[PDB]
Every structure is written in structure tokens, then in C-alpha cells.
């Protein structure tokens, strides 16, 4: 799978509370994390499905 699927979730420096999904390489599934509103990294999806297609899909 893409290398970014292995990266930890990144909240970033902004102060919003936006629920996003990240692929947790250890657990093997997409979990929610709190994104701050700016400077998102690639392991950040708006739905579990987008997250699964990118990283868990097989």
C-alpha cells in the first residue's frame, strides 16, 4: 500500500476540532482522529471508505 498509510495521524497546529479518518497500520483499520483545520498530511480522509480504498482495500 502507499507509504503514507504507515504514517501516524497529524492534528497539525490549527485549533479546530474536525473528525477525520487515518489508517492505523498496526490495527489494520481506519480510525477517527481530531484534525485541527490546517496542514493536513496524506493519511487523512473524510470517510472510512476513502481511507479503506487508499490503504486497507484488497
Domains and CATH numbers, the chain: 1-58 (4.10.410.10)
Phi–psi pair at 13, nearest 5 degrees: -80, -10
Resolution in Å, one decimal place:
2.0
Name the strand (E) or helix (H) holding 2. none
Residues pairing with 31 in the sheet: 22
Find out whether 25 and 2 touch, Cβ atoms under 8 Å: no
3-state SS record for 1-53: CCHHHHCCCCCCCCCCCEEEEEEECCCCEEEEEEECCCCCCCCCECCHHHHHH
Phi–psi pair at 10, nearest 5 degrees: -125, 110
The experimental method is: X-ray
Q: How many C-alpha atoms does 37 have within 13 Å on its Cβ side?
A: 5
Find out whether 43 and 22 touch, Cβ atoms under 8 Å: yes
For the CA atoms of the chain, what is the radius of gyration?
A: 11
Amino acid at each position: 500500500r502507499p507509504d503514507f498509510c504507515l504514517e501516524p495521524p497529524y492534528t497539525g497546529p490549527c485549533k479546530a476540532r474536525i473528525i477525520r479518518y487515518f489508517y492505523n497500520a498496526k490495527a489494520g483499520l481506519c480510525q477517527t482522529f481530531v484534525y485541527g483545520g490546517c496542514r493536513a498530511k496524506r493519511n487523512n480522509a473524510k470517510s472510512a471508505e476513502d481511507c479503506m480504498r487508499t490503504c486497507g482495500g484488497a
